[PDB]
Amino acid sequence: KRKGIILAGGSGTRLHPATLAISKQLLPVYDKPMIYYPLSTLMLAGIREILIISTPQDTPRFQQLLGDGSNWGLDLQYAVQPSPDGLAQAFLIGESFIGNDLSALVLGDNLYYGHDFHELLGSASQRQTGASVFAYHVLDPERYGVVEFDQGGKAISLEEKPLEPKSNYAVTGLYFYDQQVVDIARDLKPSPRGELEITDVNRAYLERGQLSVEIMGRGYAWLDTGTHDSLLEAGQFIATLENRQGLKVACPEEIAYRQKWIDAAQLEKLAAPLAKNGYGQYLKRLLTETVY
Amino acid sequence: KRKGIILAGGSGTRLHPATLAISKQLLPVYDKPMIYYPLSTLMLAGIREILIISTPQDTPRFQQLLGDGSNWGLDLQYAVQPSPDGLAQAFLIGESFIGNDLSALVLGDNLYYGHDFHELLGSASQRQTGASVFAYHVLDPERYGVVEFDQGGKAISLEEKPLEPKSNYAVTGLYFYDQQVVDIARDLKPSPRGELEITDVNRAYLERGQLSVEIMGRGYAWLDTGTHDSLLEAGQFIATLENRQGLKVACPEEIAYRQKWIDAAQLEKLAAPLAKNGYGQYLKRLLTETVY
Numbered sequence A, B: 001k002r003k004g005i006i007l008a009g010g011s012g013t014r015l016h017p018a019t020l021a022i023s024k025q026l027l028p029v030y031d032k033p034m035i036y037y038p039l040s041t042l043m044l045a046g047i048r049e050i051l052i053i054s055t056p057q058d059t060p061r062f063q064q065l066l067g068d069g070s071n072w073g074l075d076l077q078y079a080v081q082p083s084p085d086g087l088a089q090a091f092l093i094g095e096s097f098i099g100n101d102l103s104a105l106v107l108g109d110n111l112y113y114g115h116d117f118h119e120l121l122g123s124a125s126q127r128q129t130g131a132s133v134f135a136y137h138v139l140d141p142e143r144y145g146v147v148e149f150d151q152g153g154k155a156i157s158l159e160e161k162p163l164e165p166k167s168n169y170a171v172t173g174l175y176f177y178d179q180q181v182v183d184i185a186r187d188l189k190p191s192p193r194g195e196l197e198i199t200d201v202n203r204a205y206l207e208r209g210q211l212s213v214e215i216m217g218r219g220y221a222w223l224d225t226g227t228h229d230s231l232l233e234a235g236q237f238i239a240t241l242e243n244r245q246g247l248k249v250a251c252p253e254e255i256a257y258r259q260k261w262i263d264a265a266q267l268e269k270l271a272a273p274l275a276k277n278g279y280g281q282y283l284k285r286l287l288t289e290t291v292y
């Protein structure tokens, strides 16, 4: 079975003053808190048992929003990150949560969208050995881990934030790991910046021949929310799809309902308190519409 | 083989004064003229032989932009629509262009986007009998043809712009027809509004048991450009994907290049005149990037 982890840590001061109010991942993308999207993403890969790592100060705030997840058929747990020592520390912090299980790590500020996303996540979640990551063509690969391919399409190198990228293929912030991830991670020492890097972990799988790098196609939307401009862009986007469709993106209640993790009576009950606004009215409509 | 048709007709005065300047389908969605999207859509379904129907006044303008299509591996032809007698008149006007072949009709102001769009269009283009259309969940099904399904998911009725819709499933403006389409069409008389309706044609296939209605999923983007607000929304959208990816949506040159309809020397030649701007630089980069 596969446990999940959301890294919803500090972005420091780089989005202040917006974020003096609350954590980045509490800020909304259009109509719902940023963290609903990566949560919804782990739910879509069929993952029910999730660890949220954030700062000591923001843990309670996430707790208040999300609880223990039992309202939605989930078991949500929390772990505090004291210092921003890199995202590969997620595995050490999360070491007893993980235990002997498989895992998935997602960034709390990435936004995914597209057709058959459920199936793309299934095929990486389905593999019970090695590691699986997604490469997505971007304008600015310097901002991310960057995968290099040989003429045959096989991954041959990874580099973290290179000043001179080998490709425009960025590694997305959504990752799948077998039971080897903790131990590889424990053998890491901090990078020149002073962080435990996810790229160093993925590289170790690569050298073992156990890294699968699947392409996320250009028909998928991968966005993030690292600047005020891009956050804004992300809101417009979702808003446009939602107002077009009469359907929501990353509605956790709906997803749990479609995963069969809660039933129509439980859904109606979550809808009860929110009946006056468009969101509770949306969850009520899902009881009596067939949506393909 | 399958011929294509683009209906890029009058929107009257309903977008004036923007459109006193030029036809709607000449207006740009972000960086390229509206008509590049439905053109690109027919190209993606593997269609090379295309009839553009527009007003007498706009035919030359389309001609000037697009030519005979031979620059892009296409054979583009033109036919004038004198009066706005409905979109089912496309088949009568287009009757000798169609001849004994299969066909596809697309609206000149619809925007499609998503993963495996190429494969969704292939599976309807592949069928050599009957008709195939796509139903897409929308907020406002009153604006469109609306398909009804039975508990099993089978189409059981179609209605044009109903005041009291049976579902939120709109029939998109992208349609595939066998050789029966002209004759069915010739048996149509104008609706109460005074138009030859596409819904009446699709209904006739439905009653013959020869209408396939495939769902276009919520992971696809279906947008249109009927109002100034929505046009604007469509531009933002495309712009967001393009600036994110460093990739274009509905670049006809690129598509013809990937269809193998033109070669790397022809592409370089189309790039030559546009070298100074971002678009010609984009076509040059496609000569030497591998894009999955």
Ligand SMILES: CN(c1c(N)n(Cc2ccccc2)c(=O)[nH]c1=O)S(=O)(=O)c1ccccc1
Residues within 6 Å of the ligand: A037, A040, A041, A044, A112, A113, A114, A115, A116, A117, A118, A248, A249, A250, A251, A254, A255, A258, A259, B218, B219
């Ligand atoms: C639009 N997407 C989506 C989908 N596709 N669905 C339908 C669904 C729900 C569960 C498993 C497969 C499909 C849904 O109920 N809510 C959604 O937001 S999605 O696959 O692109 C998605 C799913 C979760 C988070 C972000 C996007």
Ligand SMILES: CN(c1c(N)n(Cc2ccccc2)c(=O)[nH]c1=O)S(=O)(=O)c1ccccc1
Residues within 6 Å of the ligand: A218, A219, B037, B040, B041, B044, B112, B113, B114, B115, B116, B117, B118, B248, B249, B250, B251, B254, B255, B258, B259
């Ligand atoms: C993003 N899309 C797209 C794609 N997918 N491609 C790649 C491609 C090109 C030809 C056949 C299959 C895939 C492309 O070269 N240009 C594109 O705009 S698309 O399928 O959503 C599309 C294609 C044509 C018009 C509008 C969207």
Ligand SMILES: [Cl-]
Residues within 6 Å of the ligand: A216, A217, A218, A219, A220, B114, B115, B116
């Ligand atoms: Cl794709």
Ligand SMILES: [Cl-]
Residues within 6 Å of the ligand: A114, A115, A116, B216, B217, B218, B219, B220
């Ligand atoms: Cl879908």
